[PDB]
């Protein structure tokens, strides 16, 4: 289930690995654009459902009434979306999704406002009174299967990107040949063979007489691998 419009939750994502390449590459997405970044490289994710016209109007640098009224964006990161018509549209109308018609002031970049506070709309002090020349600021749209592209609901995520690591690529270990290697952060060239030494559990690399890094624990199957130079 998605945050309803004006019931937004920008989730902080950190201290984990994530694969943006996979999220990006899937054929299920309706749209995808990045701002100074690229998903092929692999932090917040605000996940919600809005109408197609708003999907198109709420984006970094995009001017429009609704962006200024909902979630104003300038940012470094990506905006991704996928049509949710078969999740959110209901027969008779899904009216749980409010849109803002009237507002006191505009939003600052990468700022959102979920308030329902009554606005005088430049004229009348409603103070709980029905909106006669003053208004309840929001009005919902009945998402129904029978609707156009700008009205279909889409699930939209604003992905800010730092605190999240991409996956690492490993290849098969090759032994008894001269290999150009990279173990975690250790690089060099030599022949990789089994070692007869053992390391304490937290030690990852070992040293020769002048501190050349030589022995290493294999990152997937910790064992001591012997690194000796080629002739």
């Amino acid at each position, epitope marked *: 289930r998605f945050a309803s419009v004006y019931a937004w939750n920008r989730k902080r994502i950190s201290n984990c690995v994530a694969d943006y390449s996979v999220l990006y590459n899937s054929a299920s997405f309706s749209t995808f654009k990045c701002y100074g970044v690229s998903p092929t490289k692999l932090v917040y994710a605000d996940s919600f459902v809005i109408r197609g016209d708003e999907v198109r109007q709420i984006a970094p640098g995009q001017t429009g009434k609704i962006a200024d009224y909902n979630y104003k964006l300038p940012f470094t990161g990506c905006v991704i979306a996928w049509n949710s018509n078969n999740l959110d549209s209901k027969v*008779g*109308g899904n*009216y749980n999704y409010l849109y803002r018609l009237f507002r006191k002031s505009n939003l600052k970049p990468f700022e959102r406002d979920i308030s329902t506070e009554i606005y005088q709309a430049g004229s009348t002090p409603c*103070n*709980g009174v*029905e*909106g006669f*020349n003053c208004y309840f600021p929001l009005q*919902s749209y009945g998402f129904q299967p029978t609707n156009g592209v700008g009205y279909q609901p889409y699930r939209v995520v604003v992905l800010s990107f730092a605190t999240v690591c991409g996956p690492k690529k490993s290849t098969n270990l090759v032994k008894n040949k001269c290999v150009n290697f990279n173990f975690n952060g250790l690089t060099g060239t030599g022949v990789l063979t089994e070692s007869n030494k053992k390391f304490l559990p937290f030690q990852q690399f070992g040293r020769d007489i002048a501190d050349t890094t030589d022995a290493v624990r294999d990152p997937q199957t910790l064992e001591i691998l012997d690194i000796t130079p080629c002739s």
Partner: antibody
Amino acid sequence: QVQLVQSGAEVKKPGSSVKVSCKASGGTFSIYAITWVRQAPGQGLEWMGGIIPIIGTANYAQKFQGRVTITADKSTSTAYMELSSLRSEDTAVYYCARDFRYCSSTRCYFWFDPWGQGTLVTVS
Amino acid sequence: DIQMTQSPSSLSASVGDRVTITCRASQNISSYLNWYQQEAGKAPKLLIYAASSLQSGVPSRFSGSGSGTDFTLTISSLQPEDFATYYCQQSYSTPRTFGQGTKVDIK
């Protein structure tokens, strides 16, 4: 859109309380005020008060201060009103209405488009 | 609130005839003056939406407009539901005020 359907008639005497609530149908319940209107024996209507479930504070008629308490719960889909300070002159049919809104851009209209059938209170 | 006056209280007409009902406000509002059609024990419908159209879904049997605080609306062919009491409401403020109520009267 929501045609609010009420409780049955009260057969109590003047000064007693009235328990009336309406069950929602349609859709679009949490937004726009749930209001109540009184129907006089014979003719004449008066607004008593109402509430938007989203805001939760309501607004009431001065004519009904001490008589009308109105609430609503968007999580229940039920409209509620309780009557007190009841007198024999308050014999009436008590109705649910929705304050349904349409917006002509800048200017909006809030109307009792949906209605209930009305709960009769026979105190007379 | 705005005081509403609605008249004639009793109209002489029968089904299929032309019936004119008027309502006047104490305040100069052009579109929040609208009428409802109510029978006791039945849910009422709003007849007029924002002065210019019909809320109830009526195919323009009724038509009207106002000037100043004076609103007039007429039906070209009177129907059985027009014997319901028409109530003129001014939605603009609170408590909402309704007029006395009018209808076609057959004895």
